[PDB]
């Protein structure tokens, strides 16, 4: 159900490229390890989890109640573009500690869903999310900690092209599930708009 053209995009971006270390909860998503020690990510799992994540994001009735995060420069443009495209609320760059935990109101807590670029770099929002029972989604590399991640999308979340492509693909699938764009023909927005230079 993964399309040929998407496989080629993944390949060009190096999305299958993990690192030399493997978190025990990421073992289920890798395919093989090369002699240089690099773990190869199973892209069928990438695709399945992208769809699961898009489904969860689409179930949030007010689009602004999904927050999308990248502290790293690598994912900042991507999260801003994802947010523009889908109506999600971006936090690109610094996340001030207490943004989630310093809360007056018990009622109508927001965000209702958190999506982050890198559980290691974005540990603060993810840890705060666990304190306040905010469900989370993350792009996860082979050595990513999954402690605070509810839905892990296995991928190269280090390389600029792969990070940009992942956010672009998430956006495309969210828009497809909403019926905002065509489920059949290619999307007019190109991945390179999401890439950090």
CSV table of C-alpha atoms in Angstrom, one decimal:
chain,number,residue,atom,x,y,z
A,1,UNK,CA,0.0,0.0,0.0
A,2,UNK,CA,3.1,2.1,0.1
A,3,UNK,CA,3.4,3.7,-3.3
A,4,UNK,CA,6.5,3.3,-5.6
A,5,UNK,CA,7.0,7.1,-5.9
A,6,UNK,CA,7.0,7.4,-2.1
A,7,UNK,CA,9.6,4.7,-1.8
A,8,UNK,CA,11.8,6.7,-4.3
A,9,UNK,CA,11.3,9.9,-2.2
A,10,UNK,CA,12.2,8.1,1.0
A,11,UNK,CA,15.4,6.7,-0.7
A,12,UNK,CA,16.5,10.1,-2.1
A,13,UNK,CA,16.1,11.7,1.4
A,14,UNK,CA,17.8,8.8,3.1
A,15,UNK,CA,14.8,8.1,5.3
A,16,UNK,CA,15.8,4.5,5.9
A,17,UNK,CA,19.1,5.5,7.5
A,18,UNK,CA,19.2,4.9,11.2
A,19,UNK,CA,22.2,5.2,13.5
A,20,UNK,CA,24.6,2.7,15.0
A,21,UNK,CA,22.6,2.4,18.3
A,22,UNK,CA,19.3,0.8,18.8
A,23,UNK,CA,16.7,1.4,21.5
A,24,UNK,CA,14.9,-1.9,22.4
A,25,UNK,CA,11.5,-0.4,21.5
A,26,UNK,CA,12.8,0.5,18.0
A,27,UNK,CA,14.0,-3.1,17.2
A,28,UNK,CA,10.4,-3.8,15.9
A,29,UNK,CA,10.9,-1.1,13.2
A,30,UNK,CA,14.4,-1.9,11.8
A,31,UNK,CA,15.1,-4.3,8.9
A,32,UNK,CA,18.9,-5.0,9.0
A,33,UNK,CA,22.2,-3.6,10.1
A,34,UNK,CA,25.1,-2.9,7.7
A,35,UNK,CA,28.8,-3.7,8.3
A,36,UNK,CA,29.4,0.0,9.1
A,37,UNK,CA,27.0,-0.6,12.0
A,38,UNK,CA,24.2,1.6,10.7
A,39,UNK,CA,20.7,0.2,11.3
A,40,UNK,CA,18.4,0.2,8.3
A,41,UNK,CA,14.8,1.3,9.1
A,42,UNK,CA,11.9,-0.7,7.6
A,43,UNK,CA,10.1,1.9,5.5
A,44,UNK,CA,6.9,-0.1,5.5
A,45,UNK,CA,6.8,0.6,9.2
A,46,UNK,CA,7.5,4.3,8.6
A,47,UNK,CA,4.5,4.4,6.2
A,48,UNK,CA,2.1,2.5,8.5
A,49,UNK,CA,3.0,4.8,11.4
A,50,UNK,CA,2.7,7.9,9.3
A,51,UNK,CA,-0.9,6.8,8.5
A,52,UNK,CA,-1.6,6.0,12.2
A,53,UNK,CA,-0.3,9.4,13.2
A,54,UNK,CA,-2.3,11.2,10.5
A,55,UNK,CA,-5.4,9.4,11.6
A,56,UNK,CA,-4.9,10.5,15.3
A,57,UNK,CA,-4.2,14.1,14.1
A,58,UNK,CA,-7.3,14.2,12.0
A,59,UNK,CA,-9.5,13.0,15.0
A,60,UNK,CA,-8.7,16.3,16.8
A,61,UNK,CA,-11.8,18.3,16.0
A,62,UNK,CA,-10.2,21.8,16.3
A,63,UNK,CA,-7.0,21.7,14.1
A,64,UNK,CA,-5.3,24.4,16.3
A,65,UNK,CA,-5.4,21.9,19.3
A,66,UNK,CA,-2.6,19.9,17.5
A,67,UNK,CA,0.8,21.3,18.4
A,68,UNK,CA,3.8,20.6,16.2
A,69,UNK,CA,7.3,21.1,17.5
A,70,UNK,CA,10.9,21.4,16.5
A,71,UNK,CA,13.6,23.0,18.7
A,72,UNK,CA,16.3,22.0,16.1
A,73,UNK,CA,16.7,24.3,13.1
A,74,UNK,CA,16.4,21.2,10.9
A,75,UNK,CA,12.7,20.8,11.5
A,76,UNK,CA,11.6,24.5,12.1
A,77,UNK,CA,10.7,25.4,8.5
A,78,UNK,CA,8.9,22.0,8.1
A,79,UNK,CA,6.8,22.4,11.3
A,80,UNK,CA,5.8,26.0,10.2
A,81,UNK,CA,4.8,24.7,6.7
A,82,UNK,CA,2.9,21.7,8.2
A,83,UNK,CA,1.0,24.1,10.5
A,84,UNK,CA,0.2,26.5,7.6
A,85,UNK,CA,-1.1,23.6,5.6
A,86,UNK,CA,-3.2,21.8,8.3
A,87,UNK,CA,-4.2,24.5,10.8
A,88,UNK,CA,-2.0,23.0,13.6
A,89,UNK,CA,-0.2,25.3,16.1
A,90,UNK,CA,3.6,25.4,15.6
A,91,UNK,CA,6.4,25.9,18.2
A,92,UNK,CA,9.6,26.3,16.2
A,93,UNK,CA,12.8,26.9,18.2
A,94,UNK,CA,12.8,27.5,21.9
A,95,UNK,CA,10.2,25.8,24.1
A,96,UNK,CA,10.0,27.7,27.4
A,97,UNK,CA,10.0,25.2,30.3
A,98,UNK,CA,6.5,25.3,31.9
A,99,UNK,CA,4.6,26.0,28.6
A,100,UNK,CA,2.6,22.8,29.3
A,101,UNK,CA,3.0,22.3,33.1
A,102,UNK,CA,2.4,25.9,34.2
A,103,UNK,CA,-1.4,25.8,33.7
A,104,UNK,CA,-4.0,27.8,35.6
A,105,UNK,CA,-7.1,26.2,34.0
A,106,UNK,CA,-8.0,22.6,34.6
A,107,UNK,CA,-10.8,22.9,32.0
A,108,UNK,CA,-10.3,22.7,28.2
A,109,UNK,CA,-6.6,22.0,28.4
A,110,UNK,CA,-4.7,22.7,25.2
A,111,UNK,CA,-2.9,21.3,23.2
A,112,UNK,CA,-4.9,18.0,22.9
A,113,UNK,CA,-2.1,16.4,20.8
A,114,UNK,CA,1.6,16.9,20.5
A,115,UNK,CA,3.8,16.0,17.5
A,116,UNK,CA,7.6,16.5,17.8
A,117,UNK,CA,10.6,16.2,15.5
A,118,UNK,CA,13.1,14.5,17.7
A,119,UNK,CA,12.5,13.0,21.2
A,120,UNK,CA,16.1,13.7,22.2
A,121,UNK,CA,16.2,17.4,21.2
A,122,UNK,CA,12.5,17.9,22.0
A,123,UNK,CA,12.6,16.1,25.4
A,124,UNK,CA,11.2,19.1,27.3
A,125,UNK,CA,7.7,19.3,25.7
A,126,UNK,CA,7.5,15.4,25.7
A,127,UNK,CA,8.3,15.2,29.4
A,128,UNK,CA,5.9,18.0,30.2
A,129,UNK,CA,3.3,16.2,28.0
A,130,UNK,CA,3.6,13.1,30.1
A,131,UNK,CA,3.1,15.2,33.3
A,132,UNK,CA,-0.2,16.5,32.0
A,133,UNK,CA,-1.5,13.4,30.1
A,134,UNK,CA,-1.0,15.0,26.7
A,135,UNK,CA,-0.7,12.3,24.0
A,136,UNK,CA,2.4,12.5,21.8
A,137,UNK,CA,3.7,11.5,18.4
A,138,UNK,CA,7.3,11.7,17.4
A,139,UNK,CA,9.6,11.1,14.5
A,140,UNK,CA,11.9,8.5,16.0
A,141,UNK,CA,15.3,7.4,14.9
A,142,UNK,CA,16.8,4.0,15.9
A,143,UNK,CA,18.4,5.4,19.1
A,144,UNK,CA,15.5,7.7,20.0
A,145,UNK,CA,14.1,7.3,23.5
A,146,UNK,CA,10.5,6.2,23.3
A,147,UNK,CA,9.7,6.7,27.0
A,148,UNK,CA,7.5,9.8,26.4
A,149,UNK,CA,6.3,8.8,22.8
A,150,UNK,CA,2.8,7.3,22.4
A,151,UNK,CA,3.0,6.9,18.5
A,152,UNK,CA,6.5,6.5,17.2
A,153,UNK,CA,7.1,7.1,13.5
A,154,UNK,CA,10.4,5.3,12.7
A,155,UNK,CA,12.6,7.3,10.4
A,156,UNK,CA,15.8,9.2,9.8
A,157,UNK,CA,14.9,12.2,11.9
A,158,UNK,CA,18.5,13.7,11.7
A,159,UNK,CA,19.0,14.5,8.0
A,160,UNK,CA,17.4,17.7,6.7
A,161,UNK,CA,15.9,16.1,3.6
A,162,UNK,CA,14.3,13.2,5.6
A,163,UNK,CA,13.0,15.5,8.3
A,164,UNK,CA,11.4,17.8,5.7
A,165,UNK,CA,10.0,14.9,3.7
A,166,UNK,CA,8.5,13.3,6.8
A,167,UNK,CA,6.6,16.5,7.8
A,168,UNK,CA,5.5,17.0,4.2
A,169,UNK,CA,4.2,13.4,4.0
A,170,UNK,CA,2.4,13.7,7.3
A,171,UNK,CA,0.7,16.9,6.0
A,172,UNK,CA,-0.2,15.3,2.7
A,173,UNK,CA,-1.9,12.3,4.5
A,174,UNK,CA,-3.7,14.6,7.0
A,175,UNK,CA,-5.1,16.6,4.0
A,176,UNK,CA,-6.0,13.4,2.2
A,177,UNK,CA,-7.9,12.0,5.2
A,178,UNK,CA,-9.8,15.3,5.5
A,179,UNK,CA,-10.7,15.2,1.8
A,180,UNK,CA,-8.9,18.5,1.4
A,181,UNK,CA,-6.7,17.1,-1.4
A,182,UNK,CA,-7.0,14.2,-3.8
A,183,UNK,CA,-6.3,10.7,-2.4
A,184,UNK,CA,-5.3,9.5,-5.9
A,185,UNK,CA,-3.0,12.0,-7.8
A,186,UNK,CA,0.2,13.6,-6.5
A,187,UNK,CA,0.1,16.7,-4.3
A,188,UNK,CA,1.0,20.1,-5.9
A,189,UNK,CA,3.2,21.2,-2.9
A,190,UNK,CA,6.7,19.8,-3.3
A,191,UNK,CA,8.8,18.3,-0.4
A,192,UNK,CA,11.6,20.9,-0.9
A,193,UNK,CA,9.4,23.7,0.5
A,194,UNK,CA,9.7,21.8,3.9
A,195,UNK,CA,13.5,21.4,3.8
A,196,UNK,CA,15.9,23.4,6.0
A,197,UNK,CA,18.9,24.7,3.9
